[PDB]
Amino acid sequence: SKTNLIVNYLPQNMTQEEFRSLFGSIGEIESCKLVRDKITGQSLGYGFVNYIDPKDAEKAINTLNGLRLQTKTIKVSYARPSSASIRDANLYVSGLPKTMTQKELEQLFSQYGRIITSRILVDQVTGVSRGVGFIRFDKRIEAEEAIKGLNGQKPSGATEPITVKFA
């Protein structure tokens, strides 16, 4: 992209100043905002940082992505243009082979469009896949095509069919 970044998985405790302070260390910022609920005013867990120099936006991703703050591992990536087309493109998937890895889940779903995030939920005990997860596409239309194409289908080698629906 260029100069605008979206930072996800920010801890609920991180303030607007600590946010600007953390990213301001990379280089000059034209603007940045820790997004908060319109009514409660509480952090929504993500924010945006727009640098003056695109080289610093690149440095921010290279140096800050994966930084562990409190219980989170933040993600820093390029913010795609604010368009209604990228909204509601999150899918909840279930019935996946428990042997399936995130790499395979994304290869399966990538046929339908650019994947923003993907995750396989694991048992909060032994760490065994639950065969359930999420896939967030770039465009809502791509998620629509993935539902039509994969909902109720059996992914190569799978003995059981998977379920795909909007989160």
Residues that bind RNA (CB under 7 A): 4, 6, 8-9, 12, 33, 35, 37, 42-46, 48, 71-75, 77, 79-83, 86-87, 90, 92, 116-117, 119, 121-122, 124, 130, 132, 134, 136, 165, 167
Q: How far apart are CA 164 and CA 89, in angstroms?
A: 12
Q: Which is nearer to RNA, 140 or 156 (CB)?
A: 140
Kindly report the backbone phi and psi dihedral angles of residue 41, in degrees, each rounded to the nearest multiple of 5, phi listed first.
Answer: 75, 10
Q: How far is the CB of 1 from RNA (least distance, A)?
A: 9
Q: How far is the CB of 156 from RNA (least distance, A)?
A: 24
Q: Which is nearer to RNA, 118 or 157 (CB)?
A: 118
Q: Which residues contact 147 (CB under 8 A, 6 or more apart)?
A: 91, 164, 165, 166
Q: How far is the CB of 111 from RNA (least distance, A)?
A: 20
Residue 146: count of CB within 10 angstroms of its CB = 23
Q: Which is nearer to RNA, 38 or 156 (CB)?
A: 38
Report yes or no: 51 and 3 within 8 Å, Cβ to Cβ.
Answer: yes
Q: Which is nearer to RNA, 43 or 155 (CB)?
A: 43
- Which residues in the chain belong to E strands, given as ranges? 4-8, 29-36, 43-51, 68-69, 72-73, 75-78, 90-94, 115-122, 129-137, 163-166
Q: How far apart are CA 14 and CA 23, in angstroms?
A: 13
Q: How far is the CB of 5 from RNA (least distance, A)?
A: 9
Q: How far is the CB of 27 from RNA (least distance, A)?
A: 18
Q: Which is nearer to RNA, 26 or 137 (CB)?
A: 137
Q: What is the dihedral of CA 82, 93, 44, 35, to 10 degrees?
A: -10
